[PDB]
Amino acid sequence: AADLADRFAELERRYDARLGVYVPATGTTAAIEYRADERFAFCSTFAAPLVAAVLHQNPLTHLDKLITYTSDDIRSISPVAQQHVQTGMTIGQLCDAAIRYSDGTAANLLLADLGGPGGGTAAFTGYLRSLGDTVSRLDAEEPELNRDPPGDERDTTTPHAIALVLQQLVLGNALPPDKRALLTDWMARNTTGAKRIRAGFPADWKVIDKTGTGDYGRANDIAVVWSPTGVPYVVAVMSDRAGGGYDAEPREALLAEAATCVAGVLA
Numbered sequence: 001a002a003d004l005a006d007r008f009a010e011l012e013r014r015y016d017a018r019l020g021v022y023v024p025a026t027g028t029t030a031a032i033e034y035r036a037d038e039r040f041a042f043c044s045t046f047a048a049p050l051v052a053a054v055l056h057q058n059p060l061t062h063l064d065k066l067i068t069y070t071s072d073d074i075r076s077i078s079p080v081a082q083q084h085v086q087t088g089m090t091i092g093q094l095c096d097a098a099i100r101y102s103d104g105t106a107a108n109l110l111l112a113d114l115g116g117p118g119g120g121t122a123a124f125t126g127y128l129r130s131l132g133d134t135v136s137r138l139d140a141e142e143p144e145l146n147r148d149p150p151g152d153e154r155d156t157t158t159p160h161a162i163a164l165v166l167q168q169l170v171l172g173n174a175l176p177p178d179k180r181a182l183l184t185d186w187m188a189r190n191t192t193g194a195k196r197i198r199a200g201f202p203a204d205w206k207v208i209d210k211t212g213t214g215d216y217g218r219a220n221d222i223a224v225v226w227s228p229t230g231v232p233y234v235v236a237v238m239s240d241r242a243g244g245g246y247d248a249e250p251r252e253a254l255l256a257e258a259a260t261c262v263a264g265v266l267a
């Protein structure tokens with residue numbers, strides 16, 4: 001706050017970055033928005049609504065179905081799937097890995113499970129449309145979805161759009177309570193987000209999140225946070241550093257600082 005928009009702009013200059021932030025309005029707080037309707041690549045953030053789509057589409061015990069895969073299926077960072085290729089992974093294990101480790105092979109297999117044209121990308125986009133998101137689009141799977149040139153609309157969402165999607169999934173009634181809890185718990189146990197939105201909120205706030213990182217210095221985090229008294233907020237922070245070209249380093253610190261600024265306003 002000096003003001004908030006000024007603080008975000010200062011961060012953009014510091015990190016030679018484009019920063020997008022959205023926090024939906026609540027009973028007593030106005031929406032926080034900065035470049036909130038600009039498009040940014042999903043990166044692995046899409047895996048959160050992907051898991052919601054797969055959960056919604058199937059009986060709960062579909063989680064117990066074993067999926068087999070092999071060498072040519074490992075095409076992207078896949079910390080868990082690389083370890084289990086010899087035995088296979090259940091849908092539940094794939095959901096766990098896709099969310100908690102940003103496992104790209106897991107995401108790819110879940111896309112294939114959802115099925116339909118574009119290896120599942122069309123049905124994934126259709127799931128978002130069913131939640132009233134007319135903005136986001138997924139066009140490729142991993143790793144290609146991380147590589148669209150700056151400005152290209154393929155594989156993008158916006159801080160505004162993805163926040164409203166996440167709000168419905170975790171806080172709203174997009175999913176029945178049992179599936180909602182599975183999704184929430186996986187994000188609660190995320191391993192990839194300690195230096196992002198989590199870094200910006202006091203330890204007595206609960207944080208669940210799904211990160212994303214890609215080329216052109218892309219670094220995102222979408223989260224639901226709860227105050228010490230149980231008041232929830234949805235926080236979407238997205239960034240890229242197109243000025244550094246394809247190999248621009250993603251800079252988590254930017255997201256941590258942006259989240260700290262948001263937390264200051266929400267406290």
Ligand SMILES: C[C@H]1[C@@H](SC2CN(c3nccs3)C2)[C@H](C(=O)O)N2C(=O)[C@H]([C@@H](C)O)[C@@H]12
Nearest residue numbers: 043044045076077102103104192211212213
């Ligand atoms: C690039 C990963 C991660 S960030 C990357 C994983 N990293 C580290 N692992 C151990 C130490 S740092 C850096 C990054 C992420 O979510 O943070 N993300 C995606 O988005 C892909 C894609 C395969 O789903 C991946």
